[PDB]
From Swiss-Prot, chain A:
ADP binds at residues 11, 104. It comes from Homo sapiens. Belongs to the TCP-1 chaperonin family. Component of the chaperonin-containing T-complex (TRiC), a molecular chaperone complex that assists the folding of actin, tubulin and other proteins upon ATP hydrolysis. The TRiC complex mediates the folding of WRAP53/TCAB1, thereby regulating telomere maintenance. As part of the TRiC complex may play a role in the assembly of BBSome, a complex involved in ciliogenesis regulating transports vesicles to the cilia. The lineage of its organism: Eukaryota, Metazoa, Chordata, Craniata, Vertebrata. Coiled coil: none annotated. It is found in: Cytoplasm, Cytosol; Cytoplasm, Cytoskeleton, Microtubule organizing center, Centrosome. This is T-complex protein 1 subunit alpha. The gene is TCP1. It comes from the Eukaryota.
UniProtKB/Swiss-Prot annotation, chain B:
Belongs to the TCP-1 chaperonin family. It comes from Homo sapiens (Human). This is T-complex protein 1 subunit eta. Transmembrane segments: none annotated. ATP binds at residues 19, 30. It is found in: Cytoplasm. It is linked to De novo genetic variants in nearly every subunit of the TRiC complex, including CCT7, have been found in individuals with a broad spectrum of brain malformations, and clinical phenotypes ranging from mild to severe epilepsy, developmental delay, intellectual disability, ataxia, and other features of cerebral malfunction.
Amino acid sequence: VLESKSVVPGGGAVEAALSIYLENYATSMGSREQLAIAEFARSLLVIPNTLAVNAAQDSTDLVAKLRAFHNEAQVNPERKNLKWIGLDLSNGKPRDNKQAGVFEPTIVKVKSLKFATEAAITILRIDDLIKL
Amino acid sequence: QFMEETERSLHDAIMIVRRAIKNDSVVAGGGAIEMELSKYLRDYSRTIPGKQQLLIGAYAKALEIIPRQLCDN
């Protein structure tokens, strides 16, 4: 918080807000690229699964209900029963930021998404390992 | 061999135009409607679910195969 005053409300709430935002972008783009963006969007959804796992919660139930609270894409403590915001590490319920939601810093979220893309390209590339 | 399909064209013509008289409501062909329903069911998929998202989205995806296959083959 002290280094970078810019921080981001939501942990698994951002990822799920982001899943529809990318797909909204995907519908507008059209062509071959609409499906590629869509699949990026499905992988954001692992984040709400991984926390469900640690909590011992249902995974599929847990992401569904977070996307159910929606107006526009934007995460905020203003609404939680009509917009995404927060999680808990022991429940899938949304929470406000004066309550018990999760936040992340800006830096931890931008560096992770990116790093994971450069990795995704490298493993996908190969079509050998064989002794020539 | 050519006649077999040309007969089928005239036959497809008679059925469908008749079925147009009978049900005067007519929508766009081409599998055009289905892409809009995929999208419509995708919008509701977002709104509705306590677990329903996987299954309503399955219904939506399912629609799109029908014109997509004709492109693909």
